[PDB]
Amino acid sequence: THSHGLFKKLGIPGPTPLPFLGNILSYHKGFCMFDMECHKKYGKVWGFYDGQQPVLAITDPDMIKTVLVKECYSVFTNRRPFGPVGFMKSAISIAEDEEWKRLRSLLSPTFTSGKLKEMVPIIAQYGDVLVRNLRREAETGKPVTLKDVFGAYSMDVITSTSFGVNIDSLNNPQDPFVENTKKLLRFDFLDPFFLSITVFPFLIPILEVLNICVFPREVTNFLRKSVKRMKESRLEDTHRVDFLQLMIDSQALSDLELVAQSIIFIFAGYETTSSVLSFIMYELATHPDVQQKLQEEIDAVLPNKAPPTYDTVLQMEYLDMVVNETLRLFPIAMRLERVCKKDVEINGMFIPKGVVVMIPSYALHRDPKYWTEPEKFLPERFSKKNKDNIDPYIYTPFGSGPRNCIGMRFALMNMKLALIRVLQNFSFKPCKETQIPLKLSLGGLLQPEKPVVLKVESR
Ligand code: HEM
Ligand SMILES: CC(C)(C)OC(=O)N[C@H](CSCCC(=O)NCc1cccnc1)Cc1ccccc1
């Protein structure tokens, strides 16, 4: 018939698909590894099939600019359909075509230089609570789980910035806001579920009517009333122009359409920030020279363990180098994807309506062809002297083009703002429980398989 015939017929190379599964079984080593191997084997372009769905992997920087930038609105506007979303259909990251265009520009005003600057003092409160929590754990001497302390900070930041609600999470070890969020996705291919959709996608519209989800009305009802609650607050006291505010501004934004974005943003700013800071501390711990060289810049730009400011945060060139370099090793997203909504030729390559075009970020970031010593943590590769030798289309930890990460500037600041405080008070040391080297899990979340547990000493 067809479907599986597509890449042989187009003469694009790739792994031979099995009936029904496609190349699904090759995800056994995780898909970054699968991607790494494909790159090595097939070169600049290749195809494969998630079940019956053709995916075209592309690695040329030109071709990548075309799909992410030059042809975003015209052909490549949406990501692959998600799996049973429900009312989350309207969440910006899941929305398509014109629905997305109106939400993008209704929400993009949230992350503007001035807005972040107003979040600066707000975080400079949750900064202090991170340390005072850590200082109690520097007493014992025995091992700290970064994901836990950092996850509780990030929660605090997002709930407070976007919403104006101080939920005190750092002075609340037991908290439902964080414990429901972390259980929002079990994206796992060893788990039959997301596996039994990206191979049984015909079963997606089956699940819509069954009202079943990727967070089964367990997490979403918490926030369906918890964000219904933060919503009344503003509608009552005749303050600040934030996320929760600028969504109240538009009320053509509806009600479950407001919640949906909140849920995105609550999740997004909890799981990323915390996963990346965990990665940064792992690298700083296992590279003490780099940890110090940074403690030095922080001390130089901010003497007497001074309170970080917006302006000073952008001064710290080595910090940014450290962050970018961790994000080179751990692009938390792994791949960027854009469904091709009409037949198209790009940079001299035919691509048929319906195909998913995929940019393997994790592979590009590790390309032995492009990066000298690509598995080594080498912050110096992002120096003024070297930074420009770096292709914004090979290095893409935040995606690119109109559909790139709405949360980028906030994330970078948020992270930098925590790191500053954390390092201007403590040093981090590997202990016996620390996994050296760090190995990644095989799920669809770029994560360490053992949590990063380190040692904390005062200064
Ligand atoms: C280190 C932290 C973060 C990283 C590495 C990251 C990375 C990414 C990537 C790679 C994408 C896809 C963009 C594309 O494919 O072109 C993305 C999209 C997105 N990110 Fe993030 N992100 C981070 C933090 C955040 C935060 C804190 C928020 C919350 C404000 C956020 C909200 C989003 C949204 C809403 C999208 C979808 C954008 C759209 O389709 O309009 N991200 N992010
Ligand atoms: C809908 C829900 C909030 C449950 O989650 C997602 O949006 N689904 C995607 C799965 S990846 C999980 C998070 C991660 O490790 N990295 C990516 C990320 C998440 C949020 C914001 N920025 C980056 C998440 C997703 C969202 C946008 C683009 C691609 C993936």
CA 171 to CA 155: how far, in whole Å? 12
| Alpha carbons 457 and 459: distance in angstroms, whole number | 7
204 vs 140: CA distance, rounded Å: 50
Distance between CA atoms of 22 and 54, rounded to whole angstroms? 9
CA of 236 to the centre of ligand 2 (A): 33
Q: Are 197 and 83 in contact (CB under 8 A)?
A: yes
CA of 268 from ligand 2 middle (Å) equals 6
Q: How many Å apart are CA 105 and CA 387, to the nearest integer?
A: 31
- Contact by Cβ (8 Å): 141, 133: no
Helix-strand-coil split of the chain, %, nearest 5: 50, 10, 40
**Which tokens is 72 given?**
């975003």
Ligand 1 contacts CB of residue 398 (under 6 A): yes
Helices 256-285 & 288-301, crossing angle to 10 degrees? 110
44: three-class secondary structure by DSSP: coil
**Long-range contacts made by residues 368-374, C-beta under 8 angstroms, separation at least 24?**
370/394, 371/328
State the distance from the centre of ligand 1 to the C-alpha of 165, rounded, in angstroms. Answer: 23
Residue identifier of the C-alpha nearest atom 22 of ligand 2: 268
Q: What is the DSSP letter of 2?
A: -
Probe target for ligand 1 pocket from 64, 405, 412, 413, with the most ligand atoms within 8 Å of CB? 405
Question: Are 275 and 447 contacting, i.e. CB atoms less than 8 angstroms apart?
Answer: yes
Cβ atoms within 10 Å of 306's Cβ, excluding its own: 13
- Does ligand 1 lie within 6 Å of residue 294's CB atom? no
Q: What is the secondary structure of 9-31 as a DSSP string?
A: HHT---PPPBTTTBTGGGGGG-H
Within 8 A by CB and 6+ apart from 125, the residues are none
Domain of residue 324, CATH code: 1.10.630.10
Distance 104 CA to ligand 1 centre (A): 12
Residue 357, helix vs strand vs coil: strand
Other Cβ atoms less than 10 A from the Cβ of 241: the count is 14
Q: Which residues, 6 or more positions from 220, have their beta carbon under 8 angstroms from its beta carbon? A: 86, 87, 88, 213, 263
Q: Are strands 356-359 and 426-430 parallel, antiparallel or unpaired?
A: unpaired
Residues facing 183 on adjacent strands: none
Element (H, E) at 409: helix 408-423
Q: What is the SS3 assignment for 195?
A: helix
Q: Are 159 and 165 in contact (CB under 8 A)?
A: yes
Instruction: Name the nearest CA neighbour of 331 among 298, 353, 364, 309.
Output: 364
Q: In units of Å, what resolution does this entry have?
A: 2.8
Q: Which of 92, 180, 185, 410 to mutate to test the pocket of ligand 2 (most atoms within 8 A of CB)?
A: 185
Distance of alpha carbon 121 from alpha carbon 79, whole angstroms:
36
Name the one residue in this structure whose structure tokens are 């070890």.
173
In the chain, the number of structural domains is: 1
Residue 318: give the domain boundaries: 1-459
Sheet holding 426-430, edge to edge: 144-145, 453-458, 426-430
How far is 106 from 273, CA to CA, in rounded Å? 23
Q: How far, in Å, CA of 79 to CA of 341, rounded?
A: 10
Task: Say whether 72 counts as a known binding-site residue.
Answer: no
Which tokens hold the place of 43? 């070169």
Of 361, 276, 309, 271, residue with least CA distance to 58: 361
Is 123 within 8 Å of 161 (Cβ atoms)? yes
| Phi and psi at residue 329, to the nearest 5° | -70, -35
Q: Give SS3 for 454.
A: strand
Calculate Rg over the CA atoms of the chain. 22
Quick check: CB of 406 below 6 Å from ligand 1?
yes
135: three-class secondary structure by DSSP:
helix
Chain centroid offset of residue 374 CA: 21
Q: How deeply is 454 buried, as exposed, middle or buried, from its count of CB atoms within 10 A (0-12, 13-18, 19+)? A: buried
Question: How does DSSP classify residue 66?
Answer: I
After which residues does the chain have a break in its backbone, defined as C to next N over 2.5 Å? 238, 251
Q: For residue 16, give both structure tokens.
A: 């031979």
Q: For 7, what's the count of Cα atoms within 13 Å in the CB-facing half-sphere?
A: 24
Helix (H, G, I), strand (E, B) or coil at 337: strand
Question: Who lines ligand 2 at CB under 6 A?
Answer: 88, 93, 184-185, 187, 264, 267-268, 271-272, 332-333, 405, 407, 445
Q: Could you say which ligand is closest to the alpha carbon of residue 362?
A: 1
Residues listed for the chain:
459
CA distance 200 to 191: 14
Which of 93, 215, 267 best tests ligand 2's pocket when mutated (most atoms within 8 Å of CB)? 93
* CA separation for the pair 98, 166 (Å, rounded): 35
Distance CA 9, CA 365 (A): 30
> Running DSSP on this structure, what letter comes out for residue 56?
E
Question: What are the tokens at 164?
Answer: 């104006």
Helix, strand or coil for residue 397? strand
- Tell me the residue ranges of DSSP E strands in 64-213: 144-145
Asked if residue 49 lies in contact with residue 224, where contact means CB atoms within 8 angstroms, the answer is no
Distance CA 138, CA 79 (A): 44
